Design a protein around this ligand. Structure first.
Ligand code: HEM
Length: 154
């Protein structure tokens, strides 16, 4: 839960690359999530009728939601762990409305790592991977704690 300064800078350095193309990274990540863990697709009534990869690729709406998701994540990462304010609304909606278990957040964490490797063969190596994994694990543990604070089991 306590990352080094150097680890946070690895996280934010690669995130700067994500921010050069938020929608593309976002679409890539959701497509990867749905492919690797198809049960997650059922959480999205708006996407569950995209039945092939050609269909997912062509979904402009999916790109837009990629932006929605990554924009929230980016703001969280930039807080370097001091993300209580950002987690409040997100835990509320994800615990009580969307009903996303923490395990699904582990699934999307894996998709994020995968896409960062795919998109950044030059500057997302072992150290950057380790750092990003720590940052995403912190997010998951803290949001799990917030679910519980709200009275919910993630
Ligand atoms: C990094 C992890 C995630 C972030 C930062 C994130 C962020 C967001 C944001 C900002 C919204 C819109 C505002 C809101 O309702 O809170 C949203 C909506 C939503 N999210 Fe998440 N999300 C994440 C992971 C997931 C995962 C893994 C799933 C399902 C497997 C999921 C399911 C949904 C659904 C179903 C909605 C509403 C979609 C709709 O209204 O059509 N989220 N998310």
């Amino acid at each position: 839960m306590v990352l080094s300064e150097g680890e946070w800078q690895l996280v934010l350095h690669v995130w700067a690359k994500v921010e050069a193309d938020v929608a593309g990274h976002g679409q890539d990540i959701l497509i990867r999530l749905f492919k690797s863990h198809p049960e997650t697709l059922e959480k999205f009534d708006r996407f569950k009728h995209l039945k092939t990869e050609a269909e997912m690729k062509a979904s402009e709406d999916l790109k837009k939601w990629g932006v929605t998701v990554l924009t929230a994540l980016g703001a969280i990462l930039k807080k370097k762990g001091h993300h209580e304010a950002e987690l409040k609304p997100l835990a509320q909606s994800h615990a009580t409305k969307h009903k996303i278990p923490i395990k699904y957040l582990e699934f999307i964490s894996e998709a994020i790592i995968h896409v960062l490797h795919s998109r950044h063969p030059g500057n997302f190596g072992a150290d950057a991977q380790g750092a990003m994994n720590k940052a995403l694990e912190l997010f998951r543990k803290d949001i799990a704690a917030k679910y519980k604070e709200l009275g919910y089991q993630g």
